[PDB]
Design a protein around this nucleic acid. Sequence first.
RNA 1: ACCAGGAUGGCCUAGUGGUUAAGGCGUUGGACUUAAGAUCCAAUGGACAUGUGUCCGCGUCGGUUUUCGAACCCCA
RNA 2: GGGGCGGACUGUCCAGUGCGCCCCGGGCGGGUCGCG
RNA 3: GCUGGCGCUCUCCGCAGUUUUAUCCGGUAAAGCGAAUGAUUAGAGGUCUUGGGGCCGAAACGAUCUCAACCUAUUCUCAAACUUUAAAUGGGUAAGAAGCCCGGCUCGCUGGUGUGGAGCCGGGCGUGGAAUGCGAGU
RNA 4: UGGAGCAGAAGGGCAAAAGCUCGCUUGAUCUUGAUUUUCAGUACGAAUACAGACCGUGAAAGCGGGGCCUCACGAUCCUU
RNA 5: GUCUACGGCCAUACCACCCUGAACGCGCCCGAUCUCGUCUGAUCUCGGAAGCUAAGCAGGGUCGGGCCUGGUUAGUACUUGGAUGGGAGACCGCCUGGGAAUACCGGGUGCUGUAGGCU
Lengths: 159, 205, 58, 170, 293
Amino acid sequence: TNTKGKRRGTRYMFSRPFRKHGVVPLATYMRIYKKGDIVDIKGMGTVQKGMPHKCYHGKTGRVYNVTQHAVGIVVNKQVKGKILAKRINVRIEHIKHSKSRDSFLKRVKENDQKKKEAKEKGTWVQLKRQPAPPREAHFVRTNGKEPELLEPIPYEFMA
Amino acid sequence: GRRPARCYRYCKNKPYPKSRFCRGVPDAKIRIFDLGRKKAKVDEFPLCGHMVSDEYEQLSSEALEAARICANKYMVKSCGKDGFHIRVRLHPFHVIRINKMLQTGMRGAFGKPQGTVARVHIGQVIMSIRTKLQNKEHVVEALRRAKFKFPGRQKIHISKKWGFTKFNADEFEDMVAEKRLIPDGCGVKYIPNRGPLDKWRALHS
Amino acid sequence: AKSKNHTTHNQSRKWHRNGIKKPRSQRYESLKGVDPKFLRNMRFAKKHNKKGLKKMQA
Amino acid sequence: KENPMRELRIRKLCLNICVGESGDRLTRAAKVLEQLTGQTPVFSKARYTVRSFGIRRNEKIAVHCTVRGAKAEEILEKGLKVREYELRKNNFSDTGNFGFGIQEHIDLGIKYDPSIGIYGLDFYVVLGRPGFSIADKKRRTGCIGAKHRISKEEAMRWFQQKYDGIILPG
Amino acid sequence: FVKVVKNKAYFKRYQVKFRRRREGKTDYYARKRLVIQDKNKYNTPKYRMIVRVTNRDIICQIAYARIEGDMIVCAAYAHELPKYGVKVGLTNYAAAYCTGLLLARRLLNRFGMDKIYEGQVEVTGDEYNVESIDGQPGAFTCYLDAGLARTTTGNKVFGALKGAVDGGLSIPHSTKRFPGYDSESKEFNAEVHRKHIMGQNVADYMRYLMEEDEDAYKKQFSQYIKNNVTPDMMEEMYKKAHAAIRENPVYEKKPKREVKKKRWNRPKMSLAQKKDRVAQKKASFLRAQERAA
RNA sequence: ACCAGGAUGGCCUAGUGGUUAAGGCGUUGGACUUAAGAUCCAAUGGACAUGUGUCCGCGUCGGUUUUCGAACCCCA
RNA sequence: GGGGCGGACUGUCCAGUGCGCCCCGGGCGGGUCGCG
RNA sequence: GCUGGCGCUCUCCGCAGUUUUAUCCGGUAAAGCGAAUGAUUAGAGGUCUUGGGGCCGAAACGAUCUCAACCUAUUCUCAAACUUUAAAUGGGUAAGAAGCCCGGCUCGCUGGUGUGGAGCCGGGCGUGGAAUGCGAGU
RNA sequence: UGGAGCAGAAGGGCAAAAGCUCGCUUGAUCUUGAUUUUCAGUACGAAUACAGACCGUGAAAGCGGGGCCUCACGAUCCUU
RNA sequence: GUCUACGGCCAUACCACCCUGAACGCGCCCGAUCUCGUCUGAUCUCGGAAGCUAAGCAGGGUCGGGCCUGGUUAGUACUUGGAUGGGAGACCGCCUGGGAAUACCGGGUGCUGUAGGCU
Ligand SMILES: [Mg+2]
Ligand SMILES: [Mg+2]
Ligand SMILES: [Mg+2]
Ligand SMILES: [Mg+2]
Ligand SMILES: [Mg+2]
Ligand SMILES: [Mg+2]
Ligand SMILES: [Mg+2]
Ligand SMILES: [Mg+2]
Ligand SMILES: [Mg+2]
Ligand SMILES: [Mg+2]
Ligand SMILES: [Mg+2]
Ligand SMILES: [Mg+2]
Ligand SMILES: [Mg+2]
C-alpha cells in the first residue's frame, strides 16, 4: 500500500515552473477576493503555509470567507459516489481568479446592452448563442489555374 | 550459465539502467564499439552501410559482441586489416534480471541483475560500417554474416549519407567545397551563417 | 490463503446507479466558518437595522 | 589626457601573521601588528582540523589587519625599503594586485623588545581607481566595467613609475 | 585549463531576478511585508512614506500599491527648499525634516486637513503623535519605507519621519532612532534632537573649522559662504523655513513649453542596415585579400 | 540460500565515546659465554580487506563489495 | 519603382542602407460603393 | 456503498456516466542530452593547467618530440525512482431571476474620506439568454 | 543560479533567504469554536486559516502561538 | 528625446566586449566635528560640492551567446474510439477523430503605471 502523506506525489505539482523560482511577484498578494467570487486553486510551493491538499489543486471554487492572508473556499470534491461541498482555508498565494465566469459577465453585459437598446428601434436581436452552424453554400473561384494534381509518393527507405 | 536469448528477446519491462538504484551489475560483454580505422578522415570512407532492425526487440550484449566479432573478421579478411570503420550503434543499458531457484517459490521474486541488453526499435541502426565505395559487396556480406548472431529480422541498407554523418553523400563534397562542412576527425562540423564574423574571417582567410 | 487486496472495479457503476448528485446549493448558505469579528459586527448591524426604520419609510 | 579618475590608488594594504597555533605566540603577533599599524588587529580562526599542521577548527591561528589612507602608503614604502624595491613578475596577480612577505618585522624599523620576539609577516597590496567602491556599496551595486579594471601589466607599470621599482624576471 | 562557467548551458538555466532587485533599488522582502493590505480590508489603501536619500536630494513620497503599479499621492523634494529659504544643505537632517514637514502639510492641505492636525507648531523634538479628533476625519496614517537604508540612530529617514509627524501624519515610530537617543543609557534626549533638527550640529562644525583650518572651512562649506549662511542664523533660518512651509505648502507645477524635437540617442538600427553592414564587411575583407594578391 | 557474525605487525590476539596504534611470540643490533640457548640492554614493522557516506578528524559509527568461520535447511 | 528636400548611419576602393515630408509613374491585391 | 419496501413534498423551474462555447489544471506517451542531473562511444582542435617518459642540456615554460589526463567544439547510445519541451484521452468551473440596474438605511468591523466591506429594505428590467434529452425533490 | 547549507530519509522549497554571523528573546504561553488530511466523512495524530487574551521582536509595516513543508506517535478504567 | 523616486509584468529586460552621452538628474568624488559603526570613514552613518563622465547608469553596436516568437521537423512520433484487419509472434496497416518535441532555418532584443524634472 501507499503512504497517506499530505504531499505524496506532488513532486512536479507543487514545484515551481522552470526559471520561475524565488521571489513571488507581489501582485499575487494585491488581488481582491470577495465573498462568492470564483477562483482556481493551484498550490505554489514557495509558500508552505496555507497550502491546499493535492486533491484541490486544479479545482475551482467559490469564496465563502475572507481573512487577512487567506480565504475560505467552497470546493466541489468527489468522494467516491457523492460530491461534497468543501469548506477549505487556503492562502492568497495558492489561488488565482477564475476567468470562466468573467466571460459570462461579458456576455450578460452585452446581452442586457442588446435588450435595452434595439427595443426602441423595434428589431429583434439574438441572445442565446447558437453552436457552430453548418457552413453556408459558397462559390470557390479557380481563377485561371487548374487544381494541382497530387500523387502518393513512392516508398523510399529513409534510414 | 546464462539463459538463451529467447528469455529476454521482447521489451516487456520498463527500461532499467544501472544507476544508484541498480547495483551489483556485471560489466557488458561488449566493450569496444568502434573497430577498424577509427582515425580515418571523413573523405576516406564515403560509403556507409547499416544493419537496421525491423523489430521492437532486445539485443543481448553477448550477441552485440558476437556480431561485431563476425563483422570485424569478415571486414579484416575482405577489405584488409584497416580498410573499414565499424561503429556499433547500440550500447547495452537495459539490465535483465534473474530469480535463481537452486524453497521460497515466488516469494520475494525480484531478480538480481543478470546481464546487460540493448533496446532497438523498428528502423534503428544496429551496426554501421563506413568504407570505400568498391567494398560494397564486402559490407553487405559482413552485415549478412553478422545478421545470424542477432535474433529477429534485420535489413541491410546502404545509406544515402556520407559515412558516419548526418549529411547526404551527394551534397557532401560541394558543401565541403563551399566551406559549410569542415572535416573534423571521423565526421564533419557544420558551419552556419550565424556566428560572430571573426569565425567567418578565420574560415575564409 | 491469500486473497484479492484492493479494487475499484464495480464502483463507478455503483456510484452511478442512484447518480452522482451535485451537492444541494440553495440561496442563503450557512455562516459557519466565517470570520468571528466580521460575524459579530454583522450581528450588530442586523441588531440595529431597526434603528433607521423611519428613514426607510420616509 | 587620461581622466583624474583613471589614476590608480592603493585601496588597502592587508597584513597577516599566520602563526599556526593559538595563545601567547599569537598575542605577541597581534602586538607586532598593533605597533606596525597603529590599530588593533583581528584574529582569524582555522577553518577545519589538519593534524599535519597542528590546527583545530575555530582555533585562532592567524592575525590580520587592513590599513588605508596615507598609513597604507607609509607601511608599503617601509615594506619596499625592506625588499630593496625589487619584486618578481609573478608577484603580481591577474586582477591588478600585488604582494610580498617579510621574514622579520624588526627589519621594518619596529624596535625589538624581549616581551614579543620576532615575527615574519605577509603584505598584500590591493590597488584601485576611484569608483571601485560601487561593487561594495549597498544601494546600487554593480560591476566596475572592463575598461576600468586593473590589469597585471598596468599594476606593474604603476609600481615601477610610483616606487622606481625593479621587476625581477623569473 | 579551466572549465568555463558562463557557457551556453549556464545561460539556458539562468533565472534572472526582478528588475528592481537586479538594479538594487528594491528590497522585495521588505516590500511584501510593507505594501500588502490584509485581504479582509478590500481596496482599503495602505499608505507609505517612501524616504530616499540621494547624494544631493531627499525625496519623500506618499504612495499606495496597486496591481498596475504604485500610486503616488503626495511628493516633496529638497530642491524646492530654496523657495522656502533653505538655500544650502539640501541633504542634511534639517532638510530631511523640512521636506518631511512639507510632504505632510502638502498632503493635509490636499485632503482638506490643514487647519486640523497641525502637529507641533513649536519644534521641541520629543515624542509626539497625532490623535484622531471625534467628529472630524481621522488622521492620515502611513508607514515608513526606508528601502535599503540601514536604520541606525541618526538616519535622515527618521528626520523625514519627524518632519511628517510634526506636520500631522500618524506614523508608528519609536524615539530609539532619533539622534540624541543614548544607546548605553537607553534614553532619548529631546534637546539634542532639537539641535539636530535645527541644524545646530553643522553650525558647530563651521565654528569648529573657522578656528582650526580656515582653508578647510573654505573647501568644506563653499556654497554657504556664497549664499552668505553663517553659524548664527541657522536656527531662525530653519524656523522661518518651517513657518513658510506651513504658510504655503501647495506645489506649483513647472510650466511645460515647446522644444524642437531633438533626439539625443542613436535610433535602433534596422534589419536592412544590419544585413548591409555585414555584407559590406565581407566584401571589404575579401577585397583586402584579392587586392593583396 | 536466510540469519548472525569475523577480517589489524611475520604468527596469535587487543583496540571505544571519535583524536591515544597495544601486548605476547617472532625479527634486528649490542651485552653475558669458549660458543649456542636461557638471561640482560635496546630497535623496527602495521595496504588497520576494499572503496563510499557521517564527522573538523574513523581502524572505531552507517549502507555496498571481497575472503572466512558458526547455526538452520523442517512436516509429508 | 522614379524624382525633390531634410537628415541619420555604414563599409580596411568615393560606395552603400534605412527613416521623415512632398510629388509623379504605376503595376498589383482583394474589400466597399456607383455605372453598363 | 449497492437493494427492496413504505411513503412523502411538489411538478403535470430543475437535472444529466453527452456535446459545444469560454476558462483554468496536469508532467504520462512522445521527445531531449551541440539543455541542468546521471550514464556513456568515438575521433578531432589546443595549450600549460599538471604528469608520465625518450632526446638536448648543471639545468632553464631553453630548444625537442610524443603520450596521457585538462580544456574547447562535435559525435554514438540512453533513464521508472532525470528533464528544457510536451501531447491524445482526461479533471474542475461558468453558460442568469438565488441575475443584472437605481435609490436609501444599519454596523460596535474597516478608516484621510457618506471610505471600504457586509447586512438590510424599496423600486425597475423576462427575448427563461449554448445543443440534446428527461418530471424532479426528500 | 546555488552546483552549498537548512538535525536526519528522500522529494519539494529557499540568495539583501528559509542558509551563515550577531542583537534581543521565550508565540514552544492561556482560551473558544470552524476547517483540511486518513475519513465512515468517526476519533487520535498532524496540519490550516480565524477570533479573544497576554507577550516577544522590529524604527515600523509586520511576523511569531514550535522546528520551511511532507514523518517523528496513544482511547476507556486506574494512578499521579 | 530622456532621466529621477516608487513600481507592475519578471531576460524581447540577462551576459560578454566596444562606441556615444546636450541639459537636469543619478552618481563617482571631498571630509570625519556631530549621529553612527568598523581591525580599516572601504562598507554603513553623518557633514559637504573642488573635480569628472573614467566607472556605475542610459542609448546604440556584435553574420554575438542566451531569451522570446515563428517555420521546418510533420500530419512524423504518439493517441480516443472500431473491425471475425494482417502476422507464429514481435509488432504493423487501415477506419474514426485529436496531435507533439529536438537538431536545422527566419524575425525580435524590454514594454508600461503614478508623481516630479531637463530639452
Ligand atoms: Mg514486467
Ligand atoms: Mg477480499
Ligand atoms: Mg528591512
Ligand atoms: Mg507522476
Ligand atoms: Mg519515452
Ligand atoms: Mg492571537
Ligand atoms: Mg526555523
Ligand atoms: Mg476498559
Ligand atoms: Mg570616503
Ligand atoms: Mg559614467
Ligand atoms: Mg564613457
Ligand atoms: Mg542571437
Ligand atoms: Mg514613467
